[PDB]
Amino acid sequence: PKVSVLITVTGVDQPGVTATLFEVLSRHGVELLNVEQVVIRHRLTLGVLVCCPADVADGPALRHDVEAAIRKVGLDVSIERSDDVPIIREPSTHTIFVLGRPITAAAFGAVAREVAALGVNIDLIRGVSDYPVIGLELRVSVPPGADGALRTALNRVSSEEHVDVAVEDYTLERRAKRLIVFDVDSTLVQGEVIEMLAAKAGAEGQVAITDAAMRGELDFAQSLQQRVATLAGLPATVIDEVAGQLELMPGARTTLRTLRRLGYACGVVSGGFRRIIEPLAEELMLDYVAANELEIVDGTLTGRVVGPIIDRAGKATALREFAQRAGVPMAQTVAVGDGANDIDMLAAAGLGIAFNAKPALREVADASLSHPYLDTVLFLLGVTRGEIEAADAID
Amino acid sequence: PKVSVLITVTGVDQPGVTATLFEVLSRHGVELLNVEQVVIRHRLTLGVLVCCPADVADGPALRHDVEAAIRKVGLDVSIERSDDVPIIREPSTHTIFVLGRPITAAAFGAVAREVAALGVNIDLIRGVSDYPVIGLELRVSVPPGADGALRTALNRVSSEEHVDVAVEDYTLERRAKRLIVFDVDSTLVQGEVIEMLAAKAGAEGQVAITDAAMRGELDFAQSLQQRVATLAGLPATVIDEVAGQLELMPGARTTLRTLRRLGYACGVVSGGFRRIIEPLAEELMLDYVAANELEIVDGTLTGRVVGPIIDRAGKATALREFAQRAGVPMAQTVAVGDGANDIDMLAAAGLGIAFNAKPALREVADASLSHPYLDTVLFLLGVTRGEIEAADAID
Ligand SMILES: [Mg+2]
Ligand SMILES: [Mg+2]
Numbered sequence: 001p002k003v004s005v006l007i008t009v010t011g012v013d014q015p016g017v018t019a020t021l022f023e024v025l026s027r028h029g030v031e032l033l034n035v036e037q038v039v040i041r042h043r044l045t046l047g048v049l050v051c052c053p054a055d056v057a058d059g060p061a062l063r064h065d066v067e068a069a070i071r072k073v074g075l076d077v078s079i080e081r082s083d084d085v086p087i088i089r090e091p092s093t094h095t096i097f098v099l100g101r102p103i104t105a106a107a108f109g110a111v112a113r114e115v116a117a118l119g120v121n122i123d124l125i126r127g128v129s130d131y132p133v134i135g136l137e138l139r140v141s142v143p144p145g146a147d148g149a150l151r152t153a154l155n156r157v158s159s160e161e162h163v164d165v166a167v168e169d170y171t172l173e174r175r176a177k178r179l180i181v182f183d184v185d186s187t188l189v190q191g192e193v194i195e196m197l198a199a200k201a202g203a204e205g206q207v208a209i210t211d212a213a214m215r216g217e218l219d220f221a222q223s224l225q226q227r228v229a230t231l232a233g234l235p236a237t238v239i240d241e242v243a244g245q246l247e248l249m250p251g252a253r254t255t256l257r258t259l260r261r262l263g264y265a266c267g268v269v270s271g272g273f274r275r276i277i278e279p280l281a282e283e284l285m286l287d288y289v290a291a292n293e294l295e296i297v298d299g300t301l302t303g304r305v306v307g308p309i310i311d312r313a314g315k316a317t318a319l320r321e322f323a324q325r326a327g328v329p330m331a332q333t334v335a336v337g338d339g340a341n342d343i344d345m346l347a348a349a350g351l352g353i354a355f356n357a358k359p360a361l362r363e364v365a366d367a368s369l370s371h372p373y374l375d376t377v378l379f380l381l382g383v384t385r386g387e388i389e390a391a392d393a394i395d
Numbered sequence: 396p397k398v399s400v401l402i403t404v405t406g407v408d409q410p411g412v413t414a415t416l417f418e419v420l421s422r423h424g425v426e427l428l429n430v431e432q433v434v435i436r437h438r439l440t441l442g443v444l445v446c447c448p449a450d451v452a453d454g455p456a457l458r459h460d461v462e463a464a465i466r467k468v469g470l471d472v473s474i475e476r477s478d479d480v481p482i483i484r485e486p487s488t489h490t491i492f493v494l495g496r497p498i499t500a501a502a503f504g505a506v507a508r509e510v511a512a513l514g515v516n517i518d519l520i521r522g523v524s525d526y527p528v529i530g531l532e533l534r535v536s537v538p539p540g541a542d543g544a545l546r547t548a549l550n551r552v553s554s555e556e557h558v559d560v561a562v563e564d565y566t567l568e569r570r571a572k573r574l575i576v577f578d579v580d581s582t583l584v585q586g587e588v589i590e591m592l593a594a595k596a597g598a599e600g601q602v603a604i605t606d607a608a609m610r611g612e613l614d615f616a617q618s619l620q621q622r623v624a625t626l627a628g629l630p631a632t633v634i635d636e637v638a639g640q641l642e643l644m645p646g647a648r649t650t651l652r653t654l655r656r657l658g659y660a661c662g663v664v665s666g667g668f669r670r671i672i673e674p675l676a677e678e679l680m681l682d683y684v685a686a687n688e689l690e691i692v693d694g695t696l697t698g699r700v701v702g703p704i705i706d707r708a709g710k711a712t713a714l715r716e717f718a719q720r721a722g723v724p725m726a727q728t729v730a731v732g733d734g735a736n737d738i739d740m741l742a743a744a745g746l747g748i749a750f751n752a753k754p755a756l757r758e759v760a761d762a763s764l765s766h767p768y769l770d771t772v773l774f775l776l777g778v779t780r781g782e783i784e785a786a787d788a789i790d
Contacts, residue, residue, distance in 0.1 A: 102446075
């Protein structure tokens with residue numbers, strides 16, 4: 001070992017190619033510095049960086065042995081002196097997830113154009129899902145300070161091309177997320193509990209205000225007071241009744257189950273009501289619940305809540321509390337929500353994900369998901385559909 | 396979208412290729428099912444699986460547009476009907492780490508041969524380190540039930556070719572390790588504390604027994620009693636003295652620092668002495684310590700330990716305890732040790748790693764490391780050197 005030689009094998013994949021090459025190289029004084037190999041749609045690329053004697057690399061024997069062995073079976077090979085060549089590639093700085101149903105060629109084309117415009121190099125592309133949504137990952141190297149400009153460009157691409165596009169730090173630290181909190185209403189659970197409760201009072205219509213609150217049109221606490229007031233006079237029995245009518249968001253069970261496989265701490269933070277949520281959190285085996293509480297007198301709702309009120313600032317406060325108890329730094333926390341009520345929590349989390357969200361949240365969130373499948377969150381956390389299905393089939 | 400078309404682009408990498416292709420495809424009714432792209436040593440492979448109208452795919456317009464655009468800039472492209480082709484590749488079942496200094500071509504060749512012999516497919520190869528040791532990862536798909544035969548074949552390759560070879564489950568669950576324990580003596584710390592203590596009594600020679608114990612020649616407790624007895628009469632001052640003479644294993648700080656980035660719980664389990672280890676565990680900010688305790692009377696060592704004795708079974712018991720307190724399933728635990736004293740602990744852990752170990756441990760351990768760098772443990776945990784250096788340069 002004294003001088004560096006690069007060997008690159010390409011062509012139609014065949015069994016035994018890898019073994020054959022290193023067996024040939026063993027007849028020469030070769031030590032390995034780096035090997036990279038992949039097969040994509042039956043196309044092989046095998047790049048081998050070696051050190052060998054100056055004696056060996058400055059002779060045609062190494063070349064003839066390698067070229068004869070590789071060409072005979074029908075692949076191409078190149079061999080060249082190195083010495084100035086990088087031994088091992090740098091890690092990517094960021095990763096980009098593109099989700100759609102469909103993902104048009106125009107959409108992906110726009111992503112690639114914006115990326116190229118900002119001097120961002122594409123290091124790798126791969127599929128992460130074929131169901132319930134098409135999912136594609138690009139690992140990239142962003143020029144320093146440009147990731148702000150990148151997220152903006154891709155958010156514009158996202159709205160224009162009807163796909164979800166999320167840019168994430170791909171560093172060792174910032175991608176070992178370990179704690180997640182979900183908003184309940186219209187995130188973990190379908191629809192709005194308070195609307196289901198108001199329907200029992202014949203007030204579903206008025207409780208308008210929920211859409212007003214979630215878009216950020218008014219103060220959460222005052223909207224909460226007006227809405228819960230519509231429940232005044234209802235028997236407390238309604239609580240259990242509504243609890244039993246709750247449907248999980250499509251993909252919710254898969255989401256939680258997979259997060260448990262990964263060792264996540266899981267919790268919920270809601271402006272809804274503890275008596276309806278605790279029943280479900282115990283079933284879903286969650287680690288943390290923060291919620292509001294209905295006032296009850298003589299087995300009847302009074303139409304008020306018992307303070308403290310979990311408001312916008314309160315949701316972030318609960319996240320902080322949870323993370324502190326669990327020993328997880330905020331940078332390694334994830335929060336998932338849909339309403340303006342969730343703005344502070346998502347902003348506080350390491351990764352704030354807007355799920356089918358009002359515009360107010362979509363605009364401050366780290367990432368947005370627009371398809372009615374909560375398990376698309378998993379793709380943003382570095383999981384592939386194949387990995388989910390593999391682990392699920394083993395139980 | 397009605398019929399499936401595969402487009403494969405190969406050749407010398409050039410800027411703009413990716414964007415160009417999808418821009419061309421956008422002129423046709425193309426929706427994306429899967430994209431895979433990599434560039435290895437300036438060789439591009441871009442495989443694009445699409446759905447488009449039967450109208451479009453059964454006409455030469457799509458072909459001419461793609462072929463003209465790609466060939467003009469000097470790359471190759473193929474286009475073919477699919478319909479029976481896999482949309483997205485299956486996850487790998489296992490991963491194999493090859494570490495060496497050097498890794499000869501003969502060594503890697505032997506790994507590839509054993510792999511091919513057992514019908515194992517190589518899905519991907521990449522470098523994970525160039526320092527302090529050459530590190531290569533192969534992600535593979537092992538035929539069901541054959542991974543036992545594989546580890547045996549590669550352990551033989553390992554001893555014969557002078558490289559470390561470790562085979563690991565590559566499932567979602569079994570690779571989210573979250574807790575690690577280190578043996579102290581000759582693992583986290585250089586040399587043997589009890590030998591350093593015995594040297595103060597002029598008994599370093601006799602305390603023979605330590606090498607006897609670590610190879611499994613005799614019962615740990617009785618070897619411990621004979622060895623600690625040689626300390627009878629030493630002033631307790633010696634404890635602090637030896638504590639201050641301890642040198643961390645090369646790479647230990649990097650190892651712990653990186654495990655903290657990943658959110659690991661970290662601990663030590665030792666047959667050594669708490670008064671010497673607790674001082675160091677607090678400094679290294681560890682989460683758990685189990686150790687033995689020297690008996691002291693009138694500020695003098697008596698030559699006995701205060702029960703309970705952490706023996707072979709005891710080390711596993713401590714690991715279980717730690718994991719239970721931390722909420723980590725045993726399958727997601729890692730244990731690192733060098734002696735026969737560590738056999739039960741390594742066997743209990745999800746991943747048992749023998750570090751520069753006596754043969755007795757090397758033969759039952761899930762993986763063995765033979766280079767005097769503790770941070771090679773990180774490579775076995777899915778970390779690359781580039782990732783370590785990136786995170787370290789950001790602080
Ligand atoms: Mg909500
Ligand atoms: Mg030891």
